[PDB]
Design a protein around this motif. Structure first.
Motif, PDB file in Angstrom:
ATOM      1  N   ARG A  93       0.715  -1.380   0.305  1.00  0.00           N
ATOM      2  CA  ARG A  93      -0.293  -0.105   0.040  1.00  0.00           C
ATOM      3  C   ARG A  93       0.420   0.858   0.181  1.00  0.00           C
ATOM      4  N   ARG A  94       2.419   0.983   1.056  1.00  0.00           N
ATOM      5  CA  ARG A  94       2.748   2.116   0.904  1.00  0.00           C
ATOM      6  C   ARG A  94       3.188   2.646  -0.011  1.00  0.00           C
ATOM      7  N   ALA A  95       4.062   0.719  -1.360  1.00  0.00           N
ATOM      8  CA  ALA A  95       4.558   1.798  -2.266  1.00  0.00           C
ATOM      9  C   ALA A  95       3.721   1.985  -3.622  1.00  0.00           C
ATOM     10  N   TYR A  96       2.273   1.294  -3.603  1.00  0.00           N
ATOM     11  CA  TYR A  96       1.455   1.671  -4.797  1.00  0.00           C
ATOM     12  C   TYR A  96       0.984   2.704  -5.141  1.00  0.00           C
ATOM     13  N   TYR A  97      -0.139   3.370  -3.618  1.00  0.00           N
ATOM     14  CA  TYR A  97      -0.249   4.601  -3.669  1.00  0.00           C
ATOM     15  C   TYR A  97       0.578   5.219  -2.079  1.00  0.00           C
TER      16      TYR A  97
END
Lengths: 245, 245
Positions: A93-97
């Motif tokens: 979740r941190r990485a993608y958005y």
């Protein structure tokens, strides 16, 4: 080893084949495991997967985990439905958005407050790894999480080091990479909250784990098991469980 | 005659081919549509899904919807990110883990309050259908939703009749079944808020819609378009949009 109880977690997010799942759980139900280990299956509600899993899963060492929780209603709903573990895929979740470290910390603290066991996934991006920022990044995440936890809450917490660049890519962390990240994570927990707690915490590795590479990863001092995606939808998962002995 | 603007909604939950998606949106971007219709694409944040869609999608009749909202932070986050439609799969959440009718009602009211357009999915289970309880069940769900809405809020609301037994099963509601449920829904709205509002409300059918069966469904007096899963990941979705003329 004085390692705490290892965990072997099957991450079934967004799976396509539902007949395939029922067969998998049949295999699991009949799998004899000769050591102490907590197994986890995390089906989506998507299609019948979670409901079927709740219905068919009987193996005594398995529990069911949910994919993400938001608001205490969703949590209470889960408790009602009989699910008491949660996986929070923060790394992704941190990485993608760009999901915030404080958001996952709030999630953890809330889930724990409702009496859930929580598997919190933290990790750096490919970018961050290449840059040499793994430690900074991972330490930041564990720090955020700890801020929202009392000492006793750690009993309900499990950390998964899951570097995004290793997720579904076939690129597995080398034992030394995992071991460093896990050691780093544990040391922060020791400092912040005590060597006793730090010792009891399971830290699982996640990202392209399979039956060929699991054993060597588990040999590492600070590896307490695995979060497995692709290889958990295969009979291979059984090899992974056994690699945790 | 006098149907309100139809909607064609592509439900991209948990999809498992990312290159496939980019190509789909390319096709959509270049698709000329010769009537008034609101198209919607609901990608998951999972993988690059949503972020890519936001980036590549250019067709003037398309908007992006999110899959579920919880707490006003998540909503505000969505507004910030530029997304202003939400799909709430209550039909499924209720079926698979017993999500409460009042929970979905609160979600609707909250999403609307934050200025979102909301697609609320309601419907009965296979069980409830066989039992002859469709009307009772569907009416209960719309009733719950209505309790949390002021008359003006309906402008921001879209209903999808999505019988769980028709989801991803290949078993499509017959036109008469869809028509009955939609009529039933609209007649409740007419009674408890007004014929004017009831007239403007889009009620979409969802569950195993495809290019072959869409046209005949749309011919029904109370069908205002479609919520599509599987067929919305294929060029076929274009046929579905055109069935809405």
């Amino acid at each position: 080893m004085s390692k705490p109880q290892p965990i072997a977690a099957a991450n079934w997010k967004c799976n396509g084949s539902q007949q395939s799942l029922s067969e998998l759980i049949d295999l699991f139900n009949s799998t004899s495991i000769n050591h102490d280990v907590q197994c986890v299956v995390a089906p989506s509600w998507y299609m019948g997967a979670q409901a079927m899993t709740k219905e068919r899963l009987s193996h005594p060492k398995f529990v069911i985990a949910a994919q993400n929780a938001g608001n205490a209603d969703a949590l209470a709903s889960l408790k009602d439905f009989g699910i008491s573990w949660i996986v929070l895929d923060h790394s992704e979740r941190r990485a993608y958005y760009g999901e915030t470290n404080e958001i996952v910390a709030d999630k953890v603290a809330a889930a724990v407050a409702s009496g859930f066991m929580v598997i919190a996934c933290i990790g750096e991006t490919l970018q961050e790894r290449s840059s040499g920022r793994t430690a900074v990044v991972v330490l930041t995440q564990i720090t955020a999480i700890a801020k929202k936890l009392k000492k006793a809450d750690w009993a309900k917490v499990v950390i998964a080091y899951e570097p995004v660049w290793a997720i579904g890519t076939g690129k597995v962390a080398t034992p030394q990479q995992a071991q460093e990240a896990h050691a780093l994570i544990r040391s922060w927990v020791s400092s912040k909250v005590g060597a006793d707690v730090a010792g009891e915490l399971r830290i699982l590795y996640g990202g392209s784990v399979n039956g060929r590479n699991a054993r060597t990863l588990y040999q590492q001092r600070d590896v307490n098991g695995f979060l497995v995606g692709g290889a958990s939808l295969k009979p291979e998962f059984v090899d992974i469980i056994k690699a945790t002995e």
